[PDB]
């Protein structure tokens, strides 16, 4: 259980697992939706779908190869999967169809067919997926006029004016050897992957990606998208949090785990050791909530999201939740900290030790692109067990107590009160 990195001008990372039955090989780039502008937003989402189109997936299926891809704000992925004794064929396909030749993929017929499907994907998302479009709107009001505001799928208006030239320009600027990591997970040995690469030569482009003029900045604000015909209210609320490669990275994750997640219709979720639940269940002000701590290269967010059918008691839900947050500065106990320690270990122990090599490749490539190295799971546990009550109170006194907030909501949100009555609940007065 250890990763091995080498460099030849090309970075090559690998987590070998001898007891698996598959192998994944791919390339991860260090540019995401936070590396484009409002005019070409969605060009990366359209690159993913050109990779996964028919005539490229057909050519892989005849050889016994499956394909995958993912767009995020800091990185992109293009992965190939196979049986363990078929990994050299995986690398060849990744060489031919992607890095060297792509005139086959950017044809006039394949481009229009791909654009039609992607527009239908995005239009469907904006009309039916309410919890996820409110979290995207939160990012856009918190980081307005800054690169961390742009949605990852793109916007239906900017996505309509794209041509092949926009794709080719974006490729020449960001798909570069200086901005790339080659990964390998599952039943694959490091030496074999290194040997297969030097037998070929395998370089995409040289480097010099553009530098981004503006840095990300948090701004307290709100955006309300009112729709009285929907049957619920969906709300998300956050403060500024921690970026990746921060000293307070695990302390913010432990603090989110203290308040946790809830489903009203599951019996065992009603019995969790969370003091907020003693307040909501007597009048049943929500159906579910979840606390998050999101982290990027430049900034982060810390907060919660909720959905509810009780549209006359929204003000009681927001009030009781924000008063529990205040206790992290004043009166958090030792039992609440020892519970969140061991449940945080179970959480990220399941994220980093699933059975899917595709998830391993995305995690590994994103971490090595920032830190140059991966922190093992035995090391992360020791940092978590060394946190005390004093560290939590010091973090909360700086990040939560009387600080500005960002809010987004949709649906039946008449009962959501104004900004300054919610902002005033971030301090107590009775300390």
């Amino acid at each position: 259980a250890e990763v091995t990195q080498l460099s030849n001008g090309i970075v090559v990372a690998t987590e070998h697992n001898p007891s698996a039955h598959t192998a994944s090989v791919g390339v991860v780039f260090g540019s995401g939706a936070a590396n484009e502008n409002p005019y070409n937003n969605g060009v990366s989402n359209l690159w993913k779908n050109i990779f996964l189109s028919k005539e490229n997936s057909a050519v892989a299926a005849k050889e016994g190869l499956a394909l995958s891809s993912n767009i995020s704000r800091d990185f992109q992925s293009y992965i190939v999967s196979s049986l363990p004794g078929s990994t050299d064929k995986s690398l060849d396909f990744l060489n031919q169809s992607f890095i060297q030749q792509k005139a086959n993929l950017l044809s006039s017929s394949n481009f229009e067919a791909t654009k039609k499907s992607v527009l239908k994907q995005v239009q469907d998302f904006e009309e039916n997926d309410h919890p996820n479009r409110v979290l995207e709107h939160l990012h856009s009001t918190a980081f307005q006029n800054t690169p961390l505001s742009l949605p990852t799928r793109g916007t239906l208006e900017s996505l309509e004016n794209l041509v092949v030239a926009d794709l080719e320009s974006f490729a020449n600027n960001h798909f570069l050897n200086s901005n790339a990591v080659v990964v390998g997970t599952g039943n694959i040995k490091h030496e074999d992957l290194v040997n297969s690469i030097e037998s070929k030569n395998l370089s995409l482009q040289t480097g010099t990606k553009p530098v981004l003029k503006k840095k990300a900045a948090f701004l307290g604000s709100e955006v309300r998208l009112r729709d009285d015909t929907l049957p619920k209210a969906w709300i998300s609320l956050a403060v500024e949090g921690e970026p990746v490669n921060s000293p307070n990275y695990f302390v913010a994750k432990l603090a989110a785990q203290i308040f946790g997640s809830y489903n009203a219709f599951e019996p065992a979720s009603r019995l969790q050791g969370i003091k907020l639940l003693d307040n909501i269940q007597e009048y049943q002000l929500c159906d579910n909530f979840n606390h998050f701590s999101l982290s990027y290269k430049d900034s982060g967010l810390w907060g919660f999201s909720t959905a509810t059918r009780n549209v006359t008691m929204i003000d009681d839900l927001i009030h009781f939740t924000l008063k529990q947050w205040n206790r992290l500065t004043i009166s958090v106990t030792d039992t609440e900290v020892e519970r969140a320690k061991s449940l945080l270990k179970l959480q990220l122990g399941q994220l980093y030790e699933s059975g899917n090599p595709v998830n391993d490749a995305n995690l590994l490539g994103a971490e090595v692109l920032i830190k140059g190295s991966k922190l093992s799971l035995g090391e992360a546990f020791k940092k978590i067990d060394a946190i005390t009550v004093k560290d939590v109170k010091a973090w909360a006194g700086k990040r939560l107590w009387d600080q500005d907030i960002a809010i987004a909501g949709t649906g039946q949100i008449e009962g959501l009160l104004d900004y300054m009555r919610i902002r005033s609940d971030m301090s107590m007065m009775r300390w």
């Binding site: 009048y283 008691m313 009681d316 009030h319």
Partner: protein
């Protein structure tokens, strides 16, 4: 729910003073009713302290 909404006596204060919905566009001509309530308190208090010395 909050104590200010559950108590018999504070529920009336909350519904009249704290959470009462008001139109967003009312101007300073809507502030005279508040003043007439302070006026009545001034007169009743000043008058009771004089009645202690009046014949």
């Amino acid at each position: 729910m909050a104590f200010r909404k559950s108590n018999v006596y504070l529920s009336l204060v909350n519904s009249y003073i704290i959470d009462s919905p008001q139109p967003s566009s009312i101007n300073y001509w809507w502030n005279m009713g508040s003043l007439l309530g302070l006026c009545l308190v001034i007169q009743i208090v000043t008058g009771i302290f004089m009645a202690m010395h009046y014949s």
